């Protein structure tokens, strides 16, 4: 009506529905923002600390030793634990390249899953900010059709009563828009930050992979070559 | 005669045509959502039980013995019998590396085909959500053309002769938009769900390929080592 | 004035020119629709038939013979002849791994070439569907500025004087969008169809490569274990 | 109305002007730094194109400015060989080296694109906040014209005026935003291609010298000694 907030609990059922929908979308985007931001800040802090702690790696056993002190909620810890148990399972063999490539593939799959579950609310906020203008537009066109059928009932060529209805319609539009814009911008921010975080996880995965390769090569080459040389060329 | 139950009465050719088109779009996307999503979540429960049972599978023959009594459409059964028949085909061959490569190729082709068949309607949902605003705009332009024809052939300043026409036009706009909204939101949520399902089937494919490679290495390593070592290192 | 079919004179000459352009664009897009759809359905039936034929393919000569009896103007026969002549050229060589590498490289190159040759008009449809709304709004603004400069050079106060040019703009927008919509529809449709076709041709190419690896391993492993170890390892 | 209608208007207006000045200063800084890096990498590529072994390349890179990814990767490959430390798995050495080089150049290219998404979102959301300003202003104007019912609309002028002013500010912030975003995409693509070229060059150098050293030492030592002593 004449008051911006006067006509909220009356003359608006579907309009109130879409308004409650968009305000719920806004608050859920805000709480997802807060929670996921805290989570990613904690994760990146822990990852940076563990990277600066493990930058002096020389072998997988020293990596595990320096990693045992990590927090139980450490993704790098579970990655190196998966690598260690995979090495344990693949033990008692000599498929060096095969072992390293199967661990590499399992690590790729694990970090993909970790990125898809860590960056979970991204699509949430994406579709939320996408549908918010849609439902706002549905609300405003429904209000427009209501005003039009009302003028069709009572043929009013004036402009007085035409104003508050279209005003509430554009109010629904603006509410949908101010629910969409924060949604899409925080979605973009989360996309960029989880891209950076998954890149960091890729760096630590490359680190542990090259460590595995290096330790396997150094433990195998010299020992195997000299021992088998001696053995089967004095006994062959 | 203004609402949906009476607008079809005085609906023109193109009005009722686009109305039938958009309501068919709405019902077909709703039915696709229901059926496809139900099938996908049921297959998700199935593969969840599958990977839960396979979490304790640490061999090839034990995996086959567990798969002996799987569901009538278990994808894991498909992959396991694929690996089995591939070993049967490329049996009596000591170049197991090429065997593993061909196995990985066949498995990636199979999982690509499975992901295509599972999300066999996501493209349709995307197309519908993309073109529904466009047919809405078609309704807009056709209705405005009709109203301008009515106001031009009748060179009068009257307002009640064109109000129902523009009312039905904006009603067509609104129904096109409220057909677009569910299409696009369902497409987005279904795309997220099918991406999760594809990630899960990728995990199970990586699991079965890891198991195949590990069991092949375990079966070949010690036997080849002892046999070749002894024979072609003592008889040389 | 009777309909859109009878308002081809009161607009600008360039407006009628671009309108005929939109009509001819829609006509040629529908022609490409019919032609490419017929060709793609023929190719789909041919692919399914060839796949059913090679369902039990386990010998290069057998595959070539069972494929030559069908239409030899098929990509399947092309790939078979390609692999056969490549093996013939690189024969009496011991680059089995390099054989597979170079063979797969040539196969994927020819597959990419054929896929590009299949999806040709899709780009044209994409451009048409992208520019049709733009040229529509261009004709719109041109008509509205022509109407405004006509009202400026004249002096009109009535409300019905803006009808002809605005209505011409509406019909221009309508033509633009009825050219745009089917453009993107068929674009995404053909995208899905060529995706499936690429999947099928990749399946058959992987089958050829699998058969090649099979036969080469059969010819290599047996001959090596029966002759290579017995040739000179006894006279050492 | 209610005296809280233009506060959001001036807020979003100053937001757009600060976003535009941030885009301008990041253009200045990133352009300066990227052109400096491009000239530096061009000069160092011209200097290193005359290299044969890793020794000459390293002794020339040690004279360059250490603020270059080139010498970083060179000494990184040297340290990776030193860590290999008498391991005869040259193939795995080359593979780990290439993987580390790829990860490093990917990280550097990622660090290069700082304001990419920034300008992207800025240019994407400025028209939307302009639309919000316009709809709120026209809503307040409708409220006013309903409180004073009349056909004369000389009061709607300031409202729509400031509304389209905010819209024009959104446009003059988005257009430079998007064009500079595309320019930055192009220049970072060029820089990524260049660092990929230099990475391929250093990897080719490493592989070539390693194969050169291994060829004779393998065809003269393991061959004769053992195939006559076996």
């Amino acid at each position: 009506d004449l008051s911006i907030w006067g006509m909220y609990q009356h003359a608006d059922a579907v309009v109130k529905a879409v308004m409650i929908g968009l305000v719920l979308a806004s608050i859920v985007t805000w709480t997802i923002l807060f929670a996921k931001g805290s989570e990613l800040l904690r994760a990146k802090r822990r990852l940076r600390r563990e990277q600066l702690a493990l930058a002096e790696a020389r072998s997988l056993d020293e990596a595990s030793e320096l990693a045992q002190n990590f927090s139980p909620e450490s993704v790098s810890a579970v990655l190196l634990n998966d690598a260690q148990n995979e090495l344990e399972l693949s033990a008692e063999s000599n498929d060096n390249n095969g072992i390293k490539e199967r661990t590499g593939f399992r690590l790729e799959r694990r970090v993909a899953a970790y990125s898809r579950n860590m960056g979970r609310g991204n699509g949430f906020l994406a579709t939320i900010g996408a549908i918010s203008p849609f439902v706002g537009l549905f609300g405003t066109v429904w209000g427009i059709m209501n005003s039009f059928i009302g003028i069709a009932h009572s043929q009013t060529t004036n402009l007085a009563v035409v104003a508050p209805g279209i005003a509430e319609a554009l109010l629904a539009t603006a509410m949908g828009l101010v629910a969409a814009i924060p949604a899409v911008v925080i979605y973009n921010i989360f996309a960029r930050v989880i891209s950076g975080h998954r890149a960091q996880v890729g760096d630590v995965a490359a680190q542990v992979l090259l460590l595995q390769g290096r330790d396997l090569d150094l433990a195998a080459t010299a020992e195997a070559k000299r021992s088998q040389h001696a053995h089967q060329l004095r006994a062959g | 005669d203004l609402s949906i139950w009476g607008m079809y009465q005085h609906a023109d050719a193109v009005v009722k045509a686009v109305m039938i088109g958009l309501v068919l779009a709405s019902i077909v996307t709703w039915t696709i959502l229901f059926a496809k999503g139900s099938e996908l979540l049921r297959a998700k429960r199935r593969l969840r039980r599958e990977q839960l049972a396979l979490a304790e599978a640490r061999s090839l023959d034990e995996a086959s013995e567990l798969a002996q009594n799987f569901s009538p459409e278990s994808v894991s059964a498909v992959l396991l019998n694929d690996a089995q028949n591939e070993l049967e085909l490329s049996a009596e061959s000591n170049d197991n590396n090429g065997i593993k490569e061909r196995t990985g190729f066949r498995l990636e082709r199979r999982v690509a085909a499975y992901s295509r068949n599972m999300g066999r309607g996501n493209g349709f949902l995307a197309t519908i959500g993309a073109i529904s605003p466009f047919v809405g705009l078609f309704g807009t332009v056709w209705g405005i053309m009709n109203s301008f024809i009515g106001i031009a052939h009748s060179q009068t300043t009257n307002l009640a002769v064109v109000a129902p026409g523009i009312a039905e036009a904006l009603l067509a706009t609104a129904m096109g938009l409220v057909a677009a909204i569910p299409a696009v939101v369902i497409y987005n949520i279904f795309a997220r769900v099918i991406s999760g399902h594809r990630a899960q089937v990728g995990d199970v494919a990586a699991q079965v390929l890891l198991l195949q490679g590990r069991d092949l290495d375990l079966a070949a390593t010690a036997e080849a080592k002892r046999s070749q070592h002894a024979h072609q290192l003592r008889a040389g | 004035d009777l309909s859109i079919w009878g308002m081809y004179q009161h607009a600008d000459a360039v407006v009628k020119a671009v309108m005929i352009g939109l009509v001819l664009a829609s006509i040629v897009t529908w022609t490409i629709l019919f032609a490419k759809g017929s060709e793609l359905l023929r190719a789909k039936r041919r692919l399914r038939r060839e796949q059913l034929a090679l369902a039990e393919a386990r010998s290069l000569d057998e595959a070539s013979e069972l494929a030559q009896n069908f239409s030899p103007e098929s990509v399947s026969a092309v790939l078979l002849n390609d692999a056969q002549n490549e093996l013939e050229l690189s024969a009496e060589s011991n680059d089995n791994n390099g054989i597979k590498e170079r063979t797969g490289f040539r196969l994927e190159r020819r597959v990419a070439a054929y896929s590009r040759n299949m999806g040709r008009g899709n780009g044209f449809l994409a451009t048409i569907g992208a520019i049709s709304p733009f040229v529509g709004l261009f004709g719109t603004v041109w008509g509205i500025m022509n109407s405004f400069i006509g009202i400026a050079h004249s002096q009109t106060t009535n409300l019905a004087v803006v009808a002809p040019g605005i209505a011409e703009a509406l019909l221009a927008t309508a033509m633009g969008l009825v050219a745009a919509i089917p453009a993107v529809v068929i674009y995404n449709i053909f995208a899905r169809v060529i995706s499936g076709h690429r999947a099928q041709v990749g399946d058959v190419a992987a089958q050829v490569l699998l058969l090649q690896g099979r036969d080469l391993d059969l010819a290599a492993t047996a001959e090596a274990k029966r002759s290579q170890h017995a040739h000179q390892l006894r006279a050492g | 109305m209610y005296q809280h209608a233009d506060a959001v208007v001036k807020a979003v207006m100053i937001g757009l002007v600060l976003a535009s000045i941030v885009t301008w200063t990041i253009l200045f800084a990133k352009g300066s730094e990227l052109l400096r890096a491009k000239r530096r990498l061009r000069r160092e590529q011209l200097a290193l194109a005359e290299a044969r072994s890793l020794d000459e390349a390293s002794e020339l890179a040690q004279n360059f400015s250490p603020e270059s990814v080139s010498a970083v990767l060179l000494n990184d490959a040297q340290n990776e060989l030193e860590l290999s430390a008498e391991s005869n798995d040259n193939n795995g050495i080359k593979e780990r080296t290439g993987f580390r080089l790829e990860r490093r150049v990917a990280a550097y290219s990622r660090n290069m694109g700082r304001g990419n998404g920034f300008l992207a979102t800025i240019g994407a959301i400025s028209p939307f906040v302009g639309l919000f300003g316009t709809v709120w202003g026209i809503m307040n104007s409708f409220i006013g014209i309903a409180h004073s019912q009349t056909t004369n609309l000389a009061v709607v002028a300031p409202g729509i005026a400031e509304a389209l002013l905010a819209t024009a500010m959104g446009l003059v912030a988005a257009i430079p935003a998007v064009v500079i975003y595309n320019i930055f995409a192009r220049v970072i693509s060029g820089h990524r291609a260049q660092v990929g070229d230099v990475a391929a060059q250093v990897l080719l150098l490493q592989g070539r010298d390693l194969d050169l050293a291994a060829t004779a030492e393998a065809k003269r030592s393991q061959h004769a000694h053992q195939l006559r002593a076996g």
Binding site: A130, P133, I144, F148, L170 | G136, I144, I166, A169, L170 | - | -
Partner: peptide
């Protein structure tokens, strides 16, 4: 991923038309 580009034009057009018809002259 984007949000939309189409939906606003509907209300722009319908408001344009309701205003040009409610125009007395």
């Amino acid at each position: 991923h984007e949000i939309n580009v189409t939906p606003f034009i509907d209300v722009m057009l319908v408001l344009l038309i309701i205003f040009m018809v409610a125009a007395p002259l």
